[PDB]
């Protein structure tokens, strides 16, 4: 199949997604509303249920109200069993409407539907081209009070109906009793609950294993994508573990929510991104543009900044998620306001680089504060708007314009008001140009692009007042006005004749899984791929096309390695790097070192035999270490994947800056577990 093919479960970078929150879209089947008290068919009082289901989303799909709009992929909320008590929260009634509070993760929430439902969802969505993605939430369960048993259900957690644990008299260490977060640092708000949620325990060995099975589940009934909730809540160590679980059984494209407030940049969240196995929604990129086209406050320069800043900042940006609002931010959209910026914001977003996302009802210009104000039933299923056929003409370029879905970016034109950007890729182009100032046009002159001579029909068809672009020869366009609030888009697409790759995933995988290459001008006829110097070919190579390649990862030894392709006649691609090969099945274990001491601005890290632990090279040193809820300074903690059952040999190290001081002694050795958890417990050599 070809890279832009619903079967794609691994890169969505040609996709729309529309995030939809499934009790309040469409109520397809009244008989499993809740009842009483926890339902409110008026869905006026939006912490109760609204009745919204699986159904109505298949409705939605088959009266062609999504496909009618060019979305291709849908991501709902989390359809494992909920808590069934209703929650006063001072006064105020709360249910589990949102999916978010678990009880058990290998069952249903009745109010969404059942099983069986699930499995029609998926195949109706399949039926129309559209991928499904599902929430996932492993962090927590649901509220619970240790003292006050029967508040809620205790956080109580079922497998498939068998009582696990609750929260109060948890022998079995199911969960965390360190306390609430204050958000105060990282460290912090992990090990702790957020909020009153039942924070889970992920390195006890139940628990772990019951998350690595649940999952497996769902991706047995054939989900095409996962959205982690609260990763920055989590072990990293652990959730790169789960990634394994995941990319070395039946590989999904996965991203978590790492929220990031306005003008906030964090070089954690980076990492994460980079190393963890999964990607991320883009903050960075969605707090920007509503600074720029909603709030006003910053410009253009501050847009481009953050456009070439993000390209440098991740390693694969173009499996960022974007988007200009959603459920924990009000809408963009206010009252009051020009409709024209919420549309420009969403034809930037659709051109931009990275995986977008709609939160369902933008196209209805739906407005709301916070939580819950942001959660409101839509309105109607109107495909008259303006902002639905913007979607409209510009989603499937995502699918036809390789520039858009892979190409780079780059600024032609700016202003503080305006932004003319080009996204390139083979001999595919697209030319974006947005005018924020609602109230005054502007003189466009010494516009240079990379299209070919020619004249250019506004891809919106004058929709957000575009115009037709005339590019002489070396590209250089002739001078022209771009309306107050104007948006247009022109393109050039013609067939790449080298090989180029677009895109890679998994980006983290054990040899032996099929990862695939996504991209063009591969050819018909099967070529090479290499990873690194190793050369592939023949059998191990399970498909090859023009645009799409699916091959196996040699046994190589763990470690990066750049991804290369060369088609039947030699010709070789572009490089593919950051790619991860993991030394074999992957355990999460717990390293503790004691009495390692440091001066200020210096911390400990860890090191070791295998590829997951840097391979000895410092640089590449697992840390800095925790030192402050599990165990405390001079003691120093870690939650870190490594390979199943391997013997592997480990020391620590001080950082400061690049300079290092190795830990004294012979190194320390231990064999990982073949499943399940552990912890490792030594103290520190001079
Ligand atoms: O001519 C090539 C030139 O075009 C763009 O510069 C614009 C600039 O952004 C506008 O603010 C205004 O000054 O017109 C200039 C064109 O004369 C690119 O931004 C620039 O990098 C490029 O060299
Ligand atoms: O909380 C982590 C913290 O640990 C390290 O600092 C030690 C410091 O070296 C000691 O002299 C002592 O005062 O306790 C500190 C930890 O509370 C790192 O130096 C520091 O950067 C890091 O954040
Ligand atoms: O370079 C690989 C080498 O790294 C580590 O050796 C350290 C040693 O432990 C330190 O005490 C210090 O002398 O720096 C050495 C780095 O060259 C591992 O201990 C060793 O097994 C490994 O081969
Ligand atoms: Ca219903
Ligand atoms: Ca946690």
């Given at each position: 199949?070809?890279?832009?093919?619903?079967?794609?479960?691994?890169?969505?970078?040609?996709?729309?997604?529309?995030?939809?929150?499934?009790?309040?879209?469409?109520?397809?089947?009244?008989?499993?509303?809740?009842?009483?008290?926890?339902?409110?068919?008026?869905?006026?009082?939006?912490?109760?249920?609204?009745?919204?289901?699986?159904?109505?989303?298949?409705?939605?799909?088959?009266?062609?109200?999504?496909?009618?709009?060019?979305?291709?992929?849908?991501?709902?909320?989390?359809?494992?069993?909920?808590?069934?008590?209703?929650?006063?929260?001072?006064?105020?009634?709360?249910?589990?409407?949102?999916?978010?509070?678990?009880?058990?993760?290998?069952?249903?929430?009745?109010?969404?539907?059942?099983?069986?439902?699930?499995?029609?969802?998926?195949?109706?969505?399949?039926?129309?081209?559209?991928?499904?993605?599902?929430?996932?939430?492993?962090?927590?369960?649901?509220?619970?009070?240790?003292?006050?048993?029967?508040?809620?259900?205790?956080?109580?957690?079922?497998?498939?109906?068998?009582?696990?644990?609750?929260?109060?008299?948890?022998?079995?260490?199911?969960?965390?009793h360190n306390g609430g977060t204050d958000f105060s640092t990282t460290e912090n708000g992990i090990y702790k609950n957020l909020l009153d949620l039942a924070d889970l325990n992920h390195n006890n060995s139940t628990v772990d294993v019951y998350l690595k099975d649940a999952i497996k589940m769902w991706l047995?009934?054939?989900?095409?994508?996962?959205?982690?909730?609260?990763?920055?809540?989590?072990?990293?160590?652990?959730?790169?573990?789960?990634?394994?679980?995941?990319?070395?059984?039946?590989?999904?494209?996965?991203?978590?929510?790492?929220?990031?407030?306005?003008?906030?940049?964090?070089?954690?969240?980076?990492?994460?991104?980079?190393?963890?196995?999964?990607?991320?929604?883009?903050?960075?990129?969605?707090?920007?543009?509503?600074?720029?086209?909603?709030?006003?406050?910053?410009?253009?320069?501050?847009?481009?900044?953050?456009?070439?800043?993000?390209?440098?900042?991740?390693?694969?940006?173009?499996?960022?998620?974007?988007?200009?609002?959603?459920?924990?931010?009000?809408?963009?959209?206010?009252?009051?306001?020009?409709?024209?910026?919420?549309?420009?914001?969403?034809?930037?977003?659709?051109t931009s680089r990275g995986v977008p996302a709609i939160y369902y009802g933008t196209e209805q210009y739906m407005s709301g504060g916070t939580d819950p104000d942001n959660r409101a039933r839509i309105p109607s299923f109107s495909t008259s708007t303006t902002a639905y056929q913007v979607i409209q003409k510009l989603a499937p370029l995502r699918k036809?314009?390789?520039?858009?879905?892979?190409?780079?970016?780059?600024?032609?034109?700016?202003?503080?008001?305006?932004?003319?950007?080009?996204?390139?890729?083979?001999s595919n182009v697209a030319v974006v140009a947005v005018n924020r100032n609602l109230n005054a046009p502007a003189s466009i002159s010494g516009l240079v692009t990379s299209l070919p001579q020619g004249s250019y029909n506004d891809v919106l068809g004058g929709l957000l007042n575009g115009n037709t672009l005339s590019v002489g020869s070396g590209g250089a366009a002739s001078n022209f006005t771009l309306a107050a609030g104007g948006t247009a888009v022109w393109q050039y697409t013609a067939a790449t004749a080298t090989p180029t790759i677009g895109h890679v995933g998994p980006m983290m995988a054990k040899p032996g899984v099929t990862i695939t290459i996504d991209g063009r001008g591969f050819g018909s006829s099967k070529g090479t791929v290499y990873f690194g110097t190793t050369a592939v070919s023949g059998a191990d190579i399970t498909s090859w096309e023009d645009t799409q390649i699916k091959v196996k990862?040699?046994?190589?030894?763990?470690?990066?390695?750049?991804?290369?392709?060369?088609?039947?006649?030699?010709?070789?691609?572009?490089?593919?790097?950051?790619?991860?090969?993991?030394?074999?099945?992957?355990?999460?274990?717990?390293?503790?070192?004691?009495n390692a001491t440091t001066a200020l601005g210096q911390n400990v890290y860890l090191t070791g035999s295998v590829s997951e632990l840097g391979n000895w090279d410092p640089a590449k040193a697992i840390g800095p270490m925790y030192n402050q809820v599990v165990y405390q300074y001079p003691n120093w903690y870690y939650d870190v994947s490594v390979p199943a059952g391997k013997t592997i040999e480990f020391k620590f190290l001080k950082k400061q800056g690049s300079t290092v001081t190795w830990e004294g002694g012979s190194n320390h050795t231990f064999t990982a577990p073949s499943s399940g958890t552990a912890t490792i417990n030594v103290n520190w050599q001079p």
């Open positions: 199949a070809p890279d832009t093919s619903v079967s794609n479960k691994q890169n969505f970078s040609t996709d729309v997604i529309y995030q939809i929150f499934t009790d309040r879209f469409s109520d397809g089947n009244p008989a499993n509303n809740p009842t009483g008290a926890a339902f409110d068919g008026t869905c006026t009082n939006l912490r109760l249920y609204c009745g919204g289901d699986w159904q109505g989303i298949i409705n939605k799909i088959n009266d062609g109200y999504l496909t009618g709009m060019g979305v291709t992929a849908i991501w709902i909320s989390q359809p494992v069993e909920n808590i069934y008590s209703i929650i006063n929260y001072s006064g105020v009634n709360n249910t589990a409407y949102h999916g978010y509070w678990a009880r058990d993760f290998k069952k249903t929430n009745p109010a969404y539907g059942t099983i069986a439902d699930f499995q029609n969802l998926i195949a109706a969505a399949h039926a129309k081209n559209i991928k499904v993605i599902i929430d996932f939430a492993p962090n927590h369960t649901s509220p619970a009070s240790s003292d006050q048993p029967s508040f809620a259900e205790n956080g109580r957690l079922y497998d498939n109906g068998t009582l696990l644990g609750g929260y109060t008299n948890d022998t079995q260490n199911l969960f965390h047995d009934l054939g989900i095409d994508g996962i959205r982690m909730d609260a990763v920055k809540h989590m072990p990293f160590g652990w959730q790169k573990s789960f990634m394994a679980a995941v990319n070395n059984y039946k590989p999904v494209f996965t991203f978590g929510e790492w929220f990031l407030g306005v003008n906030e940049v964090s070089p954690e969240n980076h990492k994460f991104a980079n190393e963890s196995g999964m990607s991320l929604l883009d903050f960075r990129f969605a707090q920007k543009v509503r600074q720029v086209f909603r709030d006003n406050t910053d410009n253009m320069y501050g847009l481009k900044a953050m456009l070439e800043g993000s390209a440098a900042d991740y390693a694969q940006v173009d499996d960022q998620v974007t988007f200009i609002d959603n459920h924990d931010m009000e809408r963009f959209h206010a009252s009051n306001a020009n409709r024209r910026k919420l549309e420009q914001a969403l034809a930037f977003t659709l036809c314009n390789p520039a858009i879905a892979y190409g780079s970016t780059q600024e032609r034109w700016i202003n503080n008001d305006v932004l003319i950007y080009e996204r390139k890729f083979g990862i040699p046994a190589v030894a763990g470690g990066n390695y750049n991804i290369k392709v060369a088609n039947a006649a030699g010709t070789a691609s572009n490089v593919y790097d950051n790619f991860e090969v993991l030394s074999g099945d992957q355990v999460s274990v717990r390293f503790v070192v004691n």
